[PDB]
């Protein structure tokens, strides 16, 4: 026999990141150079796959929801440290911000999906990416991941501005 457990979120974790500032990338226009506030001497730089989304001025010294756990890896060239929690849909492009707080230590969790990773969540594991597409905002554009609440447990809900059946990754 084998586990061959199904795809799930509570086997991944978000939190709120600092964005510092944004510039162009070293590698291909395609992308776009960003960096994240961190317990370092300096911030670190992260690389965003986005050639016609939300512009990175849009993003300059942003607050948002980022990986905890989940691991980045390399695009072009760069490696990421980090990665922004977005709405993405054809006709515009929003990032997930809960409506108040903000506060970089806040993690979205629920006892809805309890659940931690073993060592780190290793970008070879593609967990993020196996269940991203089941992760959409509702009419009332409120990101919904498996049908469960996406908020820092209890209150504190994180919702799209005007994206609605729309998909967040």
């Not at 993020?128 to 554009?141: G, R």
Request: charged share 25%.
């Amino acid at each position: 026999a084998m586990d061959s457990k199904p795809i799930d979120v509570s086997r991944l974790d978000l939190r709120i990141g600092c964005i510092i500032t944004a510039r162009k990338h070293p590698d291909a226009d395609s992308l776009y150079v960003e960096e994240v506030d961190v317990g370092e001497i300096a911030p670190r730089t992260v690389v965003s796959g986005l050639v016609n989304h939300v512009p990175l001025e849009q993003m300059q010294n942003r607050m948002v929801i980022l990986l905890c756990n989940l691991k980045p890896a390399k695009m072009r060239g760069v490696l990421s440290q980090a990665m922004v929690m977005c709405a993405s849909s054809p006709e515009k492009i929003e990032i997930l911000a809960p409506p108040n707080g903000s506060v970089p230590g806040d993690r979205i969790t629920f006892d809805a999906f309890p659940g931690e990773p073993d060592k780190e969540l290793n970008p070879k594991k593609k967990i993020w990416e196996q269940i991203q597409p089941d992760l959409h905002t509702n009419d009332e554009c409120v990101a919904t991941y498996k049908g469960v609440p996406f908020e820092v447990k209890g209150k504190g809900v994180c919702r799209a501005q005007t994206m609605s059946n729309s998909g967040i990754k």
